[PDB]
């Protein structure tokens, strides 16, 4: 696959990047004679997250791990505007549709090339692309089928970008709502299900209500007084309560504002 020329430089030393016949990247370590789906630098970042296991409040612990991941991916440099420009240019607008590894790589390369021309040596493109691809497949393609839904890719990138919190909420709600701005239970379940994979991938889903988000959908609709559909304003008001399935996001913003 042509992208191998480009991304093979994301690894060095005794590591070697390889492609399974299914098109999925994996990493060979000739020193230890092993193979792993995770990029060695992703593994190193994850091992390090154990130094946050002392943090007492789970929403804060999760936000700090996600903040560290955000910075390792350079997604704290990414505005909502620029993320949308890359999504637009790659025609990623049918949210129920699949994108394979090459479409993920292409869209991430447009994002990271632009960040790189805007920032001085902060962005190693091949490395960023490969590591962000690795995070996105770990969140959304655990069995390495080689595809993820467009809505999933947007949920990951937008949730970790540097936009203001309400802009993220508005954007994300718009991705699941109908063309007239309306969200019913099924559609909200779509967003919460994609969002909850993020803390679930860090092994912290038990502090966010568990991996079944149906109880949170019902809670949102009961909060909306059992109306059949909701609009963006009501969803923002519900998020102001920091529902348990999503509280890691607002806390992430507080972690970032607190500096580190």
């Amino acid at each position: 696959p042509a992208s191998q020329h480009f991304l093979s430089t994301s690894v060095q030393g005794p590591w070697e990047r390889a492609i399974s016949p299914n098109k999925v990247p994996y990493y060979i370590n000739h020193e230890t004679q092993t193979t792993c789906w995770d990029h060695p630098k992703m593994t190193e970042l994850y091992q390090s997250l154990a130094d946050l296991n002392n943090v007492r409040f789970s929403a804060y612990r999760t936000a700090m791990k996600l903040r560290r991941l955000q910075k390792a991916l350079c997604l704290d440099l990414l505005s909502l505007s620029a993320a949308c420009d890359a999504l637009d240019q790659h025609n990623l607008k049918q949210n129920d549709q699949p994108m394979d590894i090459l479409q993920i790589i292409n869209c991430l390369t447009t994002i990271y090339d632009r960040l790189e021309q805007e920032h001085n040596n902060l962005v190693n493109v091949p490395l960023c692309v490969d590591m962000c691809l690795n995070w996105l497949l770990n969140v959304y393609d655990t069995g390495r089928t080689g595809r993820i839904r467009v809505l999933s890719f947007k949920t990951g990138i937008i949730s970790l970008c540097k936009a203001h919190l309400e802009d993220k909420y508005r954007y994300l709600f718009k991705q699941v709502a109908s063309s007239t701005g309306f969200c019913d239970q099924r559609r909200l379940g779509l967003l919460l299900h994609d969002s909850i994979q993020i803390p679930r991938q860090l092994g912290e889903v038990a502090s966010f209500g568990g991996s079944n988000i149906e109880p949170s959908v019902r809670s949102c609709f009961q909060f909306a007084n059992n109306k059949p559909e909701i609009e963006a304003a009501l969803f923002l008001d519900w998020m102001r309560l920091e529902p348990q399935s999503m509280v890691w996001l607002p806390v992430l913003h507080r972690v970032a504002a607190a500096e580190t």
Binding site: I28, Q33, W37, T142, G143
Partner: peptide, 13 residues
């Protein structure tokens, strides 16, 4: 679903 986890190709010298 089912086979949410699978190993990568085995090491080959």
């Amino acid at each position: 679903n089912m086979t949410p986890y699978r190993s990568p190709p085995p090491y080959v010298p």
